[PDB]
Design a protein around this ligand. Structure first.
Ligand SMILES: COc1cc(/C=C(\C#N)C(=O)Nc2ccccc2O)ccc1O
Length: 328
């Protein structure tokens, strides 16, 4: 069978938390007043929710109302419980309220308002300092939720809100987030294709927080190299081949051999043999100002097949890449 895996950090956090903390199916939602919020305009319609700009008329403050699409109640309460567990954490989106929406007959999550700019728009103008700064801000959110026993499992630019005017960042859409329990096998059908960790693409279910670090690596690669997205697979199988053309097939086999994982036999005629590449090959005159030896070394240490070999969020925050970022 497959070799079990454990997170190398925050392994037992949910073990020594009270059951109330992670047993989200037993959570009791405290409903606010749905009439407190006047929807102003629709912002987006995802697979699991519609997001609206609204005003809390009890304080005349802009808020964001996320009306969930009809899904299993465990998944709704998972997100709610995770949001309430992480509330107040660094750069975690703040769940201000939960109301029962009378039209959808589904919970509407009310969040703080973040004056976001489009990441396609934003990532075109981000400076080298801007990238390191926001990466560090994402790392604060990731280390916090990991330290709280939760993996986001959907880290991608669309889930990173940035008010660039006030240099404000929020990690959002915790609808795929899960509590990490040692030895638990998780759904591999998480994260967007371009940001899926190799563990997902090889169907290894006993993953952990390190999944988010791969996704963060994919984001960093897309920014400093100005290639959106970096690993641009056409499906989940071609996705792994895209990664294997950069990280090499031999370390891929080392990875699946370490965990006694077997590749889908459909990889036999599409994977091929690929050397591991040096990150300098992706540097060119149009992105070189975003690249540094620290950037490449940091990226190198995030994008590792072996989830157990990736930098943890805290380790990533110690990296020389962030030495130039002004601390507070
Ligand atoms: C989808 O899941 C979540 C979404 C959010 C928040 C937003 C979204 N999407 C949001 O504020 N967007 C936005 C704001 C201002 C201008 C343009 C915008 O698109 C918060 C928590 C979630 O869980």
């Amino acid at each position: 069978g497959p070799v079990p895996s454990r997170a190398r950090v925050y392994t037992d956090v949910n073990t020594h938390r009270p059951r109330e903390y992670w047993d989200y199916e037993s959570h009791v939602v405290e409903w606010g007043n749905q009439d407190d919020y006047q929807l102003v305009r629709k912002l987006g319609r995802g697979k699991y929710s519609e997001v609206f700009e609204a005003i809390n008329i009890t304080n005349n403050e802009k808020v964001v109302v996320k009306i969930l699409k009809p899904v299993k109640k465990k998944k709704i309460k998972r997100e709610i419980k995770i949001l309430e567990n992480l509330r107040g954490g660094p750069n975690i989106i703040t769940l201000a309220d939960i109301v029962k929406d009378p039209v959808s007959r589904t919970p509407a999550l009310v969040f703080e308002h973040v004056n976001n700019t489009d990441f396609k728009q934003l990532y075109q103008t981000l400076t080298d300092y801007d990238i390191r700064f926001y990466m560090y801000e994402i790392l604060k959110a990731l280390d916090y939720c990991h330290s709280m026993g939760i993996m986001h499992r959907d880290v991608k630019p669309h889930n990173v809100m940035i008010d660039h005017e006030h240099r404000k960042l929020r990690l959002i859409d915790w609808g795929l987030a899960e509590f990490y329990h040692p030895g638990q096998e998780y759904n591999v059908r998480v994260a967007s294709r371009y940001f899926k960790g190799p563990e997902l693409l090889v169907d290894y279910q006993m993953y952990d927080y390190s999944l988010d670090m791969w996704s963060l690596g994919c984001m960093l690669a897309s920014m400093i190299f100005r290639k959106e997205p970096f690993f641009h697979g056409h499906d989940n199988y071609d996705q792994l081949v895209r990664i294997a053309k950069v990280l090499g097939t031999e370390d891929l086999y080392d990875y699946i051999d370490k965990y006694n994982i077997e590749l889908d036999p459909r990889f036999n005629d599409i994977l091929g043999r690929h050397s591991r590449k040096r990150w300098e090959r992706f540097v060119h005159s149009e992105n070189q100002h975003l690249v540094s030896p620290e950037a490449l070394d940091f990226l190198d240490k995030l994008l590792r097949y072996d989830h157990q070999s990736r930098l943890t969020a805290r380790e990533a925050m110690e990296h020389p890449y962030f030495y130039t970022v002004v601390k507070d």
